[PDB]
Subunit: 339 residues, 3 copies
């Protein structure tokens, strides 16, 4: 945990200005930081405020340095340096340590080295957990699923059967990976279940938020690429494919057989329909209503934002009657054209 | 479980064309299928492609049969036949087998024949589980709740107290049935909890997806009809009634005391207001904003879909100022007339 | 079971009829039978009170002439209903006593009359106040503190360093304290920002099922006293919610949003972050909140449902509204 400021600077590739023997115990916001804390400045408007910050050290740029009133770590990119130093000084505990006597683990499960399984977690037959995997308390990992080295599940995560998860993933509590996709045939109004015998394949370095659901495929697989980040409360339907490094913010709903490219950014509460493709490098702003394929990179948006309710009532009434407005406009144009 | 093609054809009521002794081990998509697999063709444009499919048998229609390049099962409805053969050849495991020594089962719980309960599940007093019920690992089933024969819960499902679930239901993980409805009275700005002492009644053959919540009623009950299918991440508020055979796709949010008729279809991410009714045979397309009662069957839609952001900025600004556009149109009409 | 006269006294209601009637429970007007008390708020029900079979009806003074049973007269029947339903509550507790299958770290501190349900897992450093009840299968992470009288239903997840006040209630499937969605970006690769802030939940907070409230990045996510939050809500890192605000089901809130006191956020609304909503704001259902709200009142958005045939035309015309605007401008110029 605690680290000499000089050592922290070397690991951050930062230029130290000040006492390298200062001991840093943790990261804090500029407002909250006290002795022993390191903090960071990304906004030069706070230069005049640094004498009010009581951090032992502040990460800043070269242009900021003349304004320091503390030991300073000078870097090109304070925000990225903050992320790195917060990892070095991370106080987040592990989901579990060692193997809980109350865990229920099938004799055929294969564990790598340094695996931890929390209290009352349930591990099915054929499961493989790679080196350094951590399964939180209360999880379920279904038959024959494989979790790659370094991956970690927080408490009360559910992995169904035949799921593959790569290395260095992180899954937050309440998430369900591998439930049945929403597949039914129809025999005269009677829904006939289509067994969902595809899988979910999750790549390396994937982070998934809490209470997110990712359904298994109907025959072929649901696929989440490497480096993807998914927020809370998302729904990823059967046979969705998400390309490497795409980010999906909270509450996004994706319908079946959607394909999303690489380096996409899907804003919170968006709705993305299925059986279509979104190309690489597309940004959908929050609450976007995606009805058609997207074939060019760029930023796309939908939605009519808030108005005072009395105003909204009129806006909505006029929009709902916009066909009459169109007809009146055309009628007027004809009269002005002398026809 | 492997099966002879002629035996499979018989169970499917299909006309066999080819070798009945072929052993089928599984179902596969047309592109993935290998020897031992059965697959199906629903799209006649793939007739010319059948010689590229390595399945041991293909389900198809009588019109497709001249194009077969394999043993064929001829049926009227290949898609329905696929559903049925996938059931016959299902590889999905059961949520549990036998009764786990780590399950915690109240002495007063009543278990039927051939009930399986997974590791660390918790069964309260007065619970009744019918024959062949399977409770996944980590589940909670609350006091006096009843689960009908053949119904199955995947892992980590929560059923509260006094819940009734019918026969042959299936509930996916993370789902919560019977939490308090959102009932509060207001006392000078402070919320006063209204205990929710109604229940949830779930019919037979209901399928519920993952991380869905169905709240119990305030006084009378939340009711899910028979044959209803509900996708993931849905919110079904207190005292909602959903008619038989209705389908609710993922992410739908329903407010309290909504009544939906039979054979409705509610598209994903729709939002439905409360204290009102939707009649039978209504379809709401995805993201529908349902504010008012629906009294006639048919298809209903809302929402302005995506545009390039530069375009959207103008669309949104113009719509928000549409009253001014309307006034100008009226003024121009008066001036011209 | 309670004598009507006693129930009326506890509700500060004026009794009209036989005080010795024994009330066993609350029921809706349509379902009520002998032994039940019910209530009416809508005067449409006056004509058919002869058909209500309750033993007593909570009503107003103006309703009293239509009464066909013992009546409790009050100013506010709905609020009185809430109070009498609490007196007559049949809801069981999430747990009774400490289950032998619960796994409780030796360093956890438990107050008086704490109950812990089967297979719950209590981490090191946890503090549970007097009369706290933890449901079956819950997880409560390291050093979290839950204040007296608070209750978790089954399968609730509380992460580490979380603080929950007194008399709270959290429904099943809810997750409090997961990582906020915080990442830096290094040449297209996401770089996790550890989320080492917390969640602070006040007193008398109720949280619905499968709701998620993320911990803050450095400073905290804060839920005020008396806040009620429905199912399937997302409260992002460093959101702050003022006292007595209500959040209906399926609301998604983005990071660093500040919501004032006495707000009402309608179901399925979407509230963007790094902005503030003042006190006494109502956002009706499905509201798309993109800008700060600085004046109290009611706000709304969205183009509602139409028959599909009509919607197709509405949507096409709105998407082309810039062309309509240009055509109107051109016509004004010509005229
Ligand atoms: C991943 C990141 C580090 C960067 C990022 O772009 C991002 C983040 N949080 C975000 N929350 N909501 C959000 C909006 C409304 C409600 C709830 C959440 C976004 O829409 C986010 C977005 C974002 C914004 C627009 C388009 C696409 C994205 Cl993904 C954090
Ligand atoms: C049940 C079925 C076999 C048939 C079906 O109609 C269906 C299905 N999946 C569906 N996903 N989304 C969906 C759309 C957007 C986001 C998430 C999911 C529908 O809206 C579906 C619908 C559907 C479409 C329109 C109206 C009502 C419904 Cl129920 C699969
Ligand atoms: C808290 C309360 C006792 C009172 C209340 O105002 C309320 C309640 N439940 C509500 N469900 N949905 C809801 C709407 C659509 C889908 C799902 C749920 C509201 O939008 C509610 C609202 C409400 C209505 C208008 C504006 C803001 C709010 Cl909060 C119950
Ligand atoms: Mg146990
Ligand atoms: Mg939603």
């Amino acid at each position: 945990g605690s680290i000499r400021l000089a050592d922290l600077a070397q690991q951050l590739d930062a230029e130290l200005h000040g006492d390298g023997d200062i001991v840093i115990t943790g990261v804090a916001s500029m407002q909250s930081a006290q002795t022993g804390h390191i903090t960071f400045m990304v906004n030069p408007k706070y230069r005049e405020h640094l004498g009010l910050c009581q951090a032992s050290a502040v990460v800043m740029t070269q242009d900021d340095l003349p304004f320091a009133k503390s030991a300073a770590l000078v870097v090109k990119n304070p925000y990225l340096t903050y992320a790195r130093m917060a990892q070095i000084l991370d106080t987040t505990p592990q989901p579990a340590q060692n193997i809980a006597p109350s865990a229920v683990i099938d004799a055929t499960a294969k564990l790598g080295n340094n695996v931890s399984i929390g209290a009352n977690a349930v591990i099915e037959s054929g499961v493989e957990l790679g080196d350094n995997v951590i399964i939180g308390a209360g999880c379920f990992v279904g038959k024959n699923s494989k979790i790659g080295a370094g991956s970690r599940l927080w408490a009360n995560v559910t992995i169904y059967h035949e799921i593959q998860i790569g290395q260095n993933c992180l899954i937050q509590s309440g998430t369900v990976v591998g439930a049945d996709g929403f597949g039914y045939a129809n025999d005269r109004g009677n829904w006939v279940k289509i067994p969902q015998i595809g899988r979910v394949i999750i790549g390396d370095r994937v982070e998934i938020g809490a209470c997110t659901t990712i359904d298994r495929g109907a025959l072929d697989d649901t696929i989440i690429g490497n480096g993807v980040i998914i927020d809370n409360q998302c729904q990823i339907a059967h046979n969705v494919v998400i390309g490497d490094n795409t980010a999906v913010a909270g509450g996004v709903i994706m319908a079946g057989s959607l394909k999303i490219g690489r380096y996409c950014m899907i804003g919170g509460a968006s709705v993305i329909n299925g059986h279509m493709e979104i190309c690489d490098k597309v940004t959908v702003t929050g609450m976007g209503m995606v009805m058609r394929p997207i074939t060019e990179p760029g930023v796309y948006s939908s939605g009519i934002p808030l108005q005072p309710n009395k105003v909204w009532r009129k806006t909505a009434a006029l929009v709902m009657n916009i066909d009459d407005m169109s007809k009146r406009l055309k009628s007027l144009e004809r009269k002005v054209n002398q026809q």
